Design an enzyme around this catalytic site. Structure first.
Site, PDB file in Angstrom:
ATOM      1  N   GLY A 159       0.887  -1.138   0.000  1.00 31.54           N
ATOM      2  CA  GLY A 159       0.000   0.000   0.000  1.00 31.54           C
ATOM      3  C   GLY A 159       0.944   1.211   0.000  1.00 31.54           C
ATOM      4  N   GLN A 160       0.671   2.120  -0.919  1.00 38.65           N
ATOM      5  CA  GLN A 160       1.407   3.383  -1.097  1.00 38.65           C
ATOM      6  C   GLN A 160       0.942   4.423  -0.114  1.00 38.65           C
ATOM      7  OE1 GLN A 160       3.509   4.350  -4.062  1.00 38.65           O
ATOM      8  NE2 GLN A 160       3.908   5.743  -2.324  1.00 38.65           N
TER       9      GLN A 160
ATOM     10  N   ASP B  28      -5.467 -10.355  14.036  1.00 40.22           N
ATOM     11  CA  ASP B  28      -4.080 -10.222  13.599  1.00 40.22           C
ATOM     12  C   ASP B  28      -3.291  -9.298  14.553  1.00 40.22           C
ATOM     13  OD1 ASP B  28      -1.927 -10.895  11.962  1.00 40.22           O
ATOM     14  OD2 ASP B  28      -2.390  -9.485  10.325  1.00 40.22           O
TER      15      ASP B  28
END
Length: 304
Positions: free
Chosen positions: A30-31, A141
């Protein structure tokens, strides 16, 4: 036009207006851009979700955003300031954090002090409880890379994966082989386990299932070995040792839920004990900022 709520105010903004301070966080794809909002001086993270992008990545970005957008009232989850939608992109303005706990452990090469971990535990448990009670979300997570810290002394749960097979290393026994595979539950208790593992890792500077070489091997250690508690030699408080022991209860049926954790003396005390997390963080980040050492050559062939 972007619409930003930041600094207590609402702003109508244009994306080309934001000062680009460079790309950030190449390690969790992801940028993302570090940007300054010139109207206020706030320095923020701006995620760029390309219309062309991988569909699975976009799906996760959007799910996560949905939860963040409705979590403004949780002090322990990173905030979204707003969004800009263009022909080709969505830019998501997020609170900028300084590091994750994974990066801190790596740059320190040793333990995070208990008093920091106490503040961390309060924040992360509260964030996870909020997610479940308010939004029905089981995170699934929890791990150091998802625990963020900043120069303000804030500790928050990351947006990444916040909307809820897994990171072997932090997987609870019942995610690997549950006592009843038909029970729909998933269950919050699995995240309590992952928090415990995370705390042992950060408190010792070593992930506790040592020297595993494959993912499956770590699963085997979770199931076959005793739970990996804080060492007793090392000066940790009785309360911290108990908190970890409780979180690392192998039988999930006997592992505490968040509401019980929130009463535990380790959390209760750190809700009000004064800890200067900001100074600690600044001092650590400066001291580990720079180092210069040439890597070893591969050994040449030798006929043994």
């Amino acid at each position: 036009t972007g619409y930003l709520t930041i600094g207590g105010q609402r702003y109508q903004a244009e994306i080309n207006d934001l000062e680009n301070l460079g790309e950030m966080g190449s390690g969790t794809c992801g940028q993302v851009w570090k940007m300054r909002f010139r109207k206020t001086g706030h320095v923020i993270a701006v995620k760029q979700m390309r219309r062309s992008g991988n569909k699975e990545e976009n799906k996760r970005i959007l799910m996560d955003l949905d939860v963040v957008l409705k979590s403004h009232d949780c002090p322990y989850i990173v905030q979204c300031f707003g969004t800009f939608i263009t022909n080709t992109d969505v830019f998501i303005a997020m609170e900028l954090m300084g590091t994750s706990a994974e990066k801190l452990k790596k740059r320190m090469q040793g333990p995070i002090p208990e008093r920091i971990l106490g503040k961390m535990t309060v924040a992360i448990v509260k964030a996870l409880y909020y997610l479940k009670e308010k939004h029905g979300v089981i995170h699934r997570d929890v791990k150091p890379s998802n625990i963020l810290l900043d120069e303000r002394g804030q500790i928050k749960l990351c947006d990444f994966g916040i909307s809820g097979a897994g990171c072997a290393a932090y997987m609870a026994p019942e995610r690997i082989d549950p006592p009843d595979p038909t029970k729909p539950d998933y269950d919050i208790r699995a995240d309590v386990w992952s928090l415990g593992i995370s705390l042992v890792e950060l408190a010792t500077g070593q992930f506790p299932y040592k020297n595993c070489k494959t993912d499956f091997e770590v699963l085997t250690k979770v199931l076959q070995e005793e739970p990996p508690l804080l060492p007793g030699h090392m000066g940790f408080s009785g309360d911290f040792q108990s908190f970890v022991k409780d979180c690392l209860t192998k039988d999930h049926r006997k592992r505490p839920k968040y509401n019980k954790l929130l009463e535990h003396s380790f959390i209760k005390r750190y809700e009000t004990l004064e800890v200067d997390v900001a100074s600690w963080f600044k001092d650590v980040m400066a001291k580990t900022e720079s180092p210069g050492v040439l890597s070893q050559p591969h050994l040449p062939f030798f006929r043994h």
